[PDB]
Amino acid sequence: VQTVTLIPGDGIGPEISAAVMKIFDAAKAPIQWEERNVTAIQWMIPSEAKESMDKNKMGLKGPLKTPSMNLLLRKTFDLYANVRPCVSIEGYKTPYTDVNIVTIRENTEGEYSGIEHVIVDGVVASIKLITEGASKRIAEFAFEYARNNHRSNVTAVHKANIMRMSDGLFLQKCREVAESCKDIKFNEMYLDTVCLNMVQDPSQFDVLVMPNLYGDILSDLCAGLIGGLGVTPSGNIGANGVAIFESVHGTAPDIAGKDMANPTALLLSAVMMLRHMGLFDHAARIEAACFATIKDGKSLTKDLGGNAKCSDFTEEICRRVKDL
Amino acid sequence: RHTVTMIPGDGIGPELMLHVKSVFRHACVPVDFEEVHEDIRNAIMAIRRNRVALKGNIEKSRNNILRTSLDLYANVIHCKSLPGVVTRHKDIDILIVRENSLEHESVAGVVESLKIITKAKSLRIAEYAFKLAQESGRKKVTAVHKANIMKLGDGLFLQCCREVAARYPQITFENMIVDNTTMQLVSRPQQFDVMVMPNLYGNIVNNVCAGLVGGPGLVAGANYGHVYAVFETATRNTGKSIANKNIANPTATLLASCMMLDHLKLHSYATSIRKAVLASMDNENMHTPDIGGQGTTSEAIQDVIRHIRVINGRAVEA
């Protein structure tokens, strides 16, 4: 039995968090949940949340309200890798049906400094940061992710023809790491070509590694291909073995307490969490049960969009996962 | 009779310009092309004689020296669905406007890059997008930005779009974070009309849209200054592998030459040619390899000419 820090979050967070905890129970997942609130105080995160996470190493986070509370978590646990698997969902048709992509985004540097200067009146310079160490670290992560998740191919996304020094450096570290892992097939592609190919045939991509700003945009483009943030899982991997898995959809205040919310994103984030800690057999069962439920379509919640309550959708997943 | 500079360019550039001339000659378009190719500064002097150029693609950088010397500050691409090319999305019609590097190593291993936003250029591009939206009867301009993360710089750009929007109260003004934009583009791209954005996002958004309507071979662009305009294809690839093989897609070049015609106020010719290329593109046998067909550019041009009705020296409605 493994303890996982659970941050319900705001709005529908408690509701969809309940659904995931129920489903994990039905699946007999060896997981027990340490619920923590993280609303920022003083600027810091509560003692009681910070201790659990340092000890438990695994965290599951619902949606938060809007210094950002996500920003504090990133600084606090040094969450340097943002990971987003994007897979088309049978039964939730979008015009892109063979998407199976993992975006991996350097999450500490780039223009998220907030560093910006008025040079003279009417002229602003924003400052983007790239470092050798972070680029090496995110590339090592993308190759390790490839190996542990049976991915064949890592593509580095860059504009190293335009930004020779900053993207060239990021590219140079990916290549250096690729020489040590010929296990995985490595190639590199210009941002603009990636965007084109993303809409023309996303089925060609496997694992995409990229600096912070590109990843922020392409990870949302990929989520758009498969149906939006409501069905996208997401992980943040940090230092000291901590990893926080999260909903990236909004809190949805309009529907907060009405048994209407869609727990798929969080659930698949939890499935992502199981895989990160080696519990593949449970991840497989829980994921199958959820996909089988969406494919059936009888119990879809309103945004997926059936005529069903979170409860019924959650109950169906529990039903199906008890049969293995 | 207008005189228009023609830059053949590299790769597929020259063979497409011959096809453009052929179509124009058949359409009896009153335009004469003067071809143009330090020598390049002398080439620019020649280009500067005429206020309009049509150019194929090329390649401190020639294409950027071009836009400097002609002071072409606005890049515009026109992403429009062609009904005969069926993609995943239909009825898209988008004008993407954007303004046409500073790095150092602080300490070993640490690189810093500077992105410049200026009030003066933001206002100029925003005015361009709003004038454009008005001139062409478009109802909406959407500013695309990342002001949530880059508060001063994209904030300044957004603020300049707001000042200009205030002088065009009859145009809806929308502003949208670049991430949400790319999400909206691959799910409901019909909501968009005129988009204006700083340079970096235009790379992403241009190629998303081009892909949404079927590929860059279908998409015309232009660069505009206060006096000069240069008309080109949206993407700058020269097609060097696919050159002299009678395989390049003529659509974007023909459509660029139509938006050059409208700029010269030769509307009846532009409409006639443009409807001819759209009607030709209803026949899948005229599609070239890059959009998934098996046709040759020769067959496609021949079909475009067959769809241009010319009566007494002038192009007419079919």
Side-chain angles (χ1 to χ4, degrees), chain A residues 240-253 255-262:
Chain A
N240 298 328
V242 49
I244 290 167
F245 299 88
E246 60 169 1
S247 273
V248 282
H249 55 73
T251 59
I255 60 151
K258 281 142 41 141
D259 201 21
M260 285 174 71
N262 170 21

Side-chain angles (χ1 to χ4, degrees), chain A residues 95-96 111-112 116 118 122-132 159 162-166 169 191-192 195-196 199-201 213 216-217 220-221 224-225 229, chain B residues 88-89 101 103-105 109-119 146 149-153 156 178-179 182-183 186 200 203-204 207-208 211-212 214-216:
Chain A
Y96 309 85
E111 45 261 270
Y112 295 69
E116 293 177 284
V118 184
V123 170
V124 179
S126 314
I127 299 207
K128 175 181 90 151
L129 198 87
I130 291 290
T131 75
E132 192 159 38
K159 289 167 46 73
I162 300 282
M163 259 146 292
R164 270 133 306 195
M165 211 178 313
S166 62
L169 173 54
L191 184 52
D192 63 276
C195 290
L196 181 57
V199 296
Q200 287 213 294
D201 192 2
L213 187 93
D216 204 348
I217 299 169
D220 283 322
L221 171 47
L225 301 178
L229 303 172
Chain B
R88 281 165 258 240
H89 316 268
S101 285
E103 336 182 81
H104 63 264
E105 209 191 47
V110 174
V111 179
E112 253 183 43
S113 200
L114 309 201
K115 176 195 148 151
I116 309 311
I117 297 281
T118 84
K119 194 190 189 41
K146 193 112 174 130
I149 271 44
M150 298 195 267
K151 291 150 215 284
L152 283 194
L156 178 58
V178 69
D179 314 44
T182 64
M183 219 162 328
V186 301
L200 155 55
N203 293 317
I204 298 185
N207 290 281
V208 168
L212 296 176

